[PDB]
UniProtKB/Swiss-Prot annotation, chain B:
This is Transcriptional regulatory protein SIN3. It comes from Saccharomyces cerevisiae (strain ATCC 204508 / S288c). Present with 1660 molecules/cell in log phase SD medium. Component of the RPD3C(L) complex composed of at least ASH1, CTI6, DEP1, PHO23, RPD3, RXT2, RXT3, SAP30, SDS3, SIN3, UME1 and UME6. Component of the RPD3C(S) complex composed of at least EAF3, RCO1, RPD3, SIN3, and UME1. Interacts with ESS1 and STB1. The lineage of its organism: Eukaryota, Fungi, Dikarya, Ascomycota, Saccharomycotina. Catalytic component of the RPD3 histone deacetylase complexes RPD3C(L) and RPD3C(S) responsible for the deacetylation of lysine residues on the N-terminal part of the core histones (H2A, H2B, H3 and H4). Histone deacetylation gives a tag for epigenetic repression and plays an important role in transcriptional regulation, cell cycle progression and developmental events. SIN3 also has a RPD3 independent function required for normal longevity. The chain holds residues 661 to 692 of 1536 of the full protein. It is found in: Nucleus.
Length: 156, 32, 142, 151
């Protein structure tokens, strides 16, 4: 039930053009990670949010989105000329003995890709009504918080 | 001020005693 | 063999058979067996026949609330195990249950999670208090 | 026993024929980028095949380990159901969503709730009620002040 505005659609289709019709992919450290986005997003919304209950849902949604990004980037959030990049990342991670982690690697734009695939992905299996509404509500206010400063993370 | 706010629930549970009465107390607090 | 301690007064007034007027009558609830004095809950009868006596600690199965007409809520009747489905919410906070719920056991991090969640929220509230009173005194000058 | 096209990336190339499902994958179209000429020796169970023989194609044990998995991670609880489908998901190329391409025993279900959720809900709703009555009192006070100033 997502109705995202035209600017997210435009930046997503221009990323599609850069990833399909062009060989160019995102930078290695992908600059600002979703770490940053979710972190500050919490630091602004929780100071705008009023109830302790709503802040519990905010932190819960942040942690779940981070873990889902980590556990689903290798499953859907990849394109051509990025599987080799992911292979290079996982061979580099085993060199310094630290375990691999997608959250602090990929850019906030693959997070927006996860939000884009989320409506079709959620309705595939058995899921609630009210939990679904909570998820799209957190989706929509996270998206409008992105819409406040798209130019911070989506400028070429 | 903060400490009593976070400590109210389990001190209420300690004052309740029986776990069935605390279950009905949580049912009351949910119905509210 | 222990003493039925009344819930409200936290005492059992057994009496002494030399001063039997010092003995307070005690009954037990017909559902949770919680013993109550006849004076702590205002009652004169012992509820010997008719309906089962319910102590004040039990949650109601029927309540009326004011609309400000009215609205009524009745708890769902018990259903046998072959046709009764108990389901666990995925949403923890704000799940609109019909008032018909079941309590599951709670299984150190959660304890401190509650502590910071009140801190932050109350902080935000102070800020919400401080953002509106300044607009009030800045309205009086105009 | 094999597929002419890769069911993940949707072009033809070097394939790995699975045993049960006829779908085949490229050497990178897998959760892990299986190194060509270095593929582990065995039957080559895929993620779907490993999900079926992990649960032994019976519903009761799969729901019980799904509930056990959700019980483990209550911090990511709303996404916990969505973490499970991933295990039973064969990684594929990101095909765009369609809108992105453009420009009765269930009625009397008893809710299984916990003490901490009741605590959070009670605190949330009392804070909501207290500050909506406080803010409406403040708004009525401001409106009455404006009415007395204008009069
Ligand atoms: Zn008494
Ligand atoms: Zn009773
Ligand atoms: Zn492929
Ligand atoms: Zn297979």
């Amino acid at each position: 039930s997502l109705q995202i505005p035209i600017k997210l659609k435009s930046v997503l289709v221009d990323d599609w053009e850069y990833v399909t019709k062009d060989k160019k992919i995102c930078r290695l450290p992908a600059d600002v990670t979703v770490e940053m986005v979710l972190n500050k997003y919490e630091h602004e919304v929780s100071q705008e949010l009023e109830s302790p209950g709503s802040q519990s849902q905010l932190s819960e949604y942040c942690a779940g989105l981070k873990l889902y990004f980590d556990k689903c980037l290798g499953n859907m959030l990849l394109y051509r000329l990025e599987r080799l990049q992911y292979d290079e990342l996982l061979k580099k991670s085993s060199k310094d003995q630290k375990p691999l982690v997608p959250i602090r690697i990929y850019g906030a734009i693959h997070l927006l890709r996860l939000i884009s695939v989320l409506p079709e992905l959620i309705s595939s299996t058995t899921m609630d009504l009210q939990s679904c509404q909570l998820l799209i509500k957190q989706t929509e206010d996270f998206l409008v918080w992105l819409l406040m400063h798209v130019d911070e993370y989506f400028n070429d | 001020s903060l400490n009593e706010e976070v400590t109210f629930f389990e001190k209420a549970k300690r004052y309740i005693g029986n776990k069935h009465l605390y279950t009905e107390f949580l049912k009351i607090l949910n119905l509210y | 063999g222990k003493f039925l301690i009344c819930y409200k007064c936290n005492q059992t007034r057994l009496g002494s058979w030399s001063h039997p007027e010092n003995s307070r009558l005690i009954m037990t609830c017909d559902y949770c067996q919680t013993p109550w004095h006849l004076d702590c809950v205002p009652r004169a009868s012992f509820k010997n026949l008719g309906s089962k006596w319910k102590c004040p600690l039990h949650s109601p199965t029927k309540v009326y609330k004011k609309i400000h007409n009215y609205k009524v809520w009745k708890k769902q009747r018990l259903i046998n195990k072959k046709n009764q489905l108990y389901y666990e919410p995925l949403q923890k906070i704000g799940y609109q249950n019909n008032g018909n719920i079941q309590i599951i056991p709670t299984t150190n991090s959660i304890k401190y999670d509650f502590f910071d969640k009140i801190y932050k929220s109350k902080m935000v509230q102070k800020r919400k208090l401080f953002q509106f009173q300044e607009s009030l005194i800045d309205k009086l000058v105009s | 026993e094999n597929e002419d096209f890769c069911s993940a990336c949707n072009q033809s190339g070097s394939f790995l024929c699975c045993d049960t499902c006829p779908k085949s994958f490229h050497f990178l179209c897998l959760d892990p980028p299986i190194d060509p000429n270095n593929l582990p020796k065995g039957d080559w169970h895929c993620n779907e095949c490993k999900f079926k023989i992990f649960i032994n194609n019976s519903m009761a044990t799969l729901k019980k380990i799904e509930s056990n998995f959700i019980k483990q991670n209550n911090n990511v609880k709303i996404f916990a159901k969505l973490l499970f489908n991933i295990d039973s998901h064969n990684p594929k190329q990101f095909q765009l969503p369609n809108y992105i391409k453009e420009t009765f025993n269930q009625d009397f279900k008893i809710t299984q709730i916990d003490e901490n959720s009741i605590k959070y809900d009670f605190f949330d709703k009392i804070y909501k009620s207290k500050m909506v009555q406080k803010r409406k009192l403040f708004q009525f006070q401001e409106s009455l002040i404006d009415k007395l100033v204008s009069n």
